[PDB]
A paper describes a structure:
AR3, from the archaebacterium Halorubrum sodomense, is a light-driven proton pump that undergoes a sequence of conformational changes induced by the absorption of a photon and is commonly used in optogenetic experiments. hA2AR is a class A G-protein-coupled receptor that is expressed in the cardiovascular, respiratory, immune and central nervous systems, and is implicated in immunosuppression and the regulation of sleep. However, the production of integral membrane protein microcrystals in lipidic cubic phase at the desired crystal density and quantity is challenging.
The crystals within the glass vials were left to incubate at 20°C for 3 to 6 h, to allow ligand exchange and binding, prior to SSX data collection at DLS on the I24 beamline. The final refined structures of hA2AR in complex with theophylline and LUAA47070 were refined to 3.45 and 3.50 Å resolution with an R work/R free of 21.85/24.12 and 21.20/25.40, respectively. Despite the resolution, our hA2AR SSX structures in complex with theophylline and LUAA47070 were well resolved with good-quality electron-density maps.
Numbering used by the authors: 0 to 208, 1001 to 1042, 1059 to 1106, 219 to 305
Write the structure that this text describes.
């Protein structure tokens, strides 16, 4: 069977993916430039991520096509075109890990969030990750490669000149690097961390969501036992437990509503200490209007804000998920090639299928923002319409 015919499909799909990679991610970068609301610390890691996806369609995919030919080239030159995609992958992981941490700081200590993360501190972080990504990605070029024991039969078959080799991935890149160093240390380890990071995010949101409900119940259940109370001692316990939850739930309309709430508990409390039973019961009745004029609104404003931060977390969680699903197949085939020599090698069409599946990750990113993030959605429309 002709080799080029099967190759014709692969090249066509690769070019198609490149087109969607460049266009889709350019729209993200253009969106952040225009809109001011999209200019924040979280989106800066998004643009860094989009930068990696753009560079896939421009270089990594052209590089992926050129490798498949098995053309003649210097072994060191062959290493760059084979390993450059590893730089772009390592950059994305650091970007995904940063977003997870940025979302964790935003939900854990929202007070300290303004002081811990800033605009400039993020730029320095991104630079370090890009520098580290080049080091990690292009590690084989420092000496950990198969240039020392080349395939001379393939070199003479291909008609390669002296010093040149038939440039193929599995020929120049050792599998111990791809499995132990790249897959396990650099990919799998940070991915497991993102799992644990997002787990602590949802768990933290779960606690705050019975906190705001425990205090609400603490307020109501202590109110109705003042009405049917027996003595001054009963009114004390119910009000002192309410006063505890009053300050607890607090952690200018905000501070003003509570000054009236706690102020009314203080007044009703002092009537209990004086022994005024019926006047203490009646004073605590004024809390009901107070409750449903300020508090109940802060119950559905604070609760509303929690759903925003959780929806933002899930939206980010999907990206890291889709990244894992796209890349993992290719890593497993590397694990089979490495760990099982008794097994047959994976067919060439399956190799092609895994590569394009890894490349597709570059396309899926902008579709998630538009479908999930409302600000990105409305931003895209006015750009397309103009
Ligand atoms: C700024 C962007 C657009 C430019 C991209 C640079 C690319 C096209 C250049 C930079 C260095 C180049 C490599 C340098 C050396 C060799 C060895 C030679 O035997 C085959 C080509 C090969 C492997 C080159 C391939 C193309 C290459 C990777
Ligand atoms: C999703 C994350 C947790 C990783 C998935 C687990 C990976 C590392 C596991 C799942 C199945 C495993 C393979 C199952 C079968 C074989 C054939 C055997 O002769 C050698 C080991 C080898 C080649 C295993 C290598 C590692 C492997 C690919
Ligand atoms: C991560 C999720 C989506 C799982 C994806 C499935 C991948 C990782 C699995 C499913 C079945 C697997 C294949 C089963 C059998 C063989 C034959 C062996 O001679 C080479 C590897 C090869 C070809 C395996 C490669 C990896 C493989 C394609
Ligand atoms: C930014 C600038 C964008 C433009 C970059 C140039 C793009 C493609 C040139 C094609 C690459 C040349 C590949 C074929 C060369 C050739 O003729 O074959 C070599 C020879 O057969 C074996 O040694
Ligand atoms: C991730 C789980 C860790 C799994 C470690 C990798 C399992 C594959 C393996 O170790 O297989 C060795 C085989 O005996 C070589 O001949
Ligand atoms: C779509 C955006 C990418 C822009 C570049 C498009 C062209 C690059 C794709 C393929 C050509 C690259 C080289 C192909 C194999 C070289 C042949 C050889 O030297 O034997
Ligand atoms: C091996 C883990 C794969 C990566 C998953 C990361 C996303 C976590 C999802 C949370 C919902
Ligand atoms: C990342 N990667 C691999 O892990 C791999 N294994 C075999 N070809 C491969 N190619 C072309 C590749 O890009
Ligand atoms: Na990417």
């Amino acid at each position: 069977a002709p080799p080029i015919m099967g190759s014709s499909v692969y090249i066509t799909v690769e070019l198609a993916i490149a087109v969607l990679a460049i266009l889709g991610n350019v729209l993200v970068c253009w969106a952040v430039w225009l809109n001011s609301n999209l200019q924040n610390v979280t989106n800066y890691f998004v643009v860094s991520l989009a930068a990696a996806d753009i560079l896939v369609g421009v270089l990594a995919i052209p590089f992926a096509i050129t490798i498949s030919t098995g053309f003649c080239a210097a072994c060191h030159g062959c290493l760059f075109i084979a390993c450059f995609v590893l730089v772009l992958a390592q950059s994305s992981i650091f970007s995904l890990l940063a977003i997870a941490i940025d979302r964790y700081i935003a939900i854990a200590i929202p007070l300290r969030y303004n002081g811990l993360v800033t605009g400039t501190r993020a730029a320095g972080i991104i630079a370090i990750c890009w520098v580290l990504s080049f080091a990690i990605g292009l590690t084989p070029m420092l000496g950990w490669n198969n240039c020392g024991q080349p395939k001379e039969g393939k070199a003479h078959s291909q008609g390669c000149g002296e010093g040149q080799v038939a440039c193929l991935f599995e020929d120049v890149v050792p599998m111990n690097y791809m499995v132990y160093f790249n897959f396990f240390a650099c990919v799998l380890v940070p991915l497991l961390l993102m799992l644990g990071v997002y787990l602590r995010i949802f768990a933290a949101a779960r606690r705050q969501l019975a906190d705001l409900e425990d205090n609400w119940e603490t307020l109501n259940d202590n109110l109705k036992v003042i009405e049917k109370a027996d003595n001054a001692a009963q009114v004390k316990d119910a009000l002192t437990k309410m006063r505890a939850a009053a300050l607890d739930a607090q952690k200018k309309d905000f501070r003003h509503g509570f000054d009236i709430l706690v102020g009314q508990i203080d007044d009703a409390l002092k009537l209990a200490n004086e022994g005024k039973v019926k006047e203490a019961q009646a004073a605590a009745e004024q809390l009901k209007t107070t409750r449903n004029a300020y508090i109940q609104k802060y119950l559905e404003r604070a609760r509303s804000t929690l759903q925003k931060e959780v929806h933002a977390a899930k939206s980010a969680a999907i990206i890291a998920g889709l990244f894992a699903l796209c890349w993992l197949p290719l890593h497993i085939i590397n694990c089979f090639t490495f760990f099982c020599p008794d097994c047959s090698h994976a067919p060439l069409w399956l190799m092609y299928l895994a590569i394009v599946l890894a490349h597709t990750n570059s396309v899926v990113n902008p579709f998630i923002y538009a479908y999930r993030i409302r600000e990105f959605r409305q931003t895209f429309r006015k750009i397309i319409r103009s």
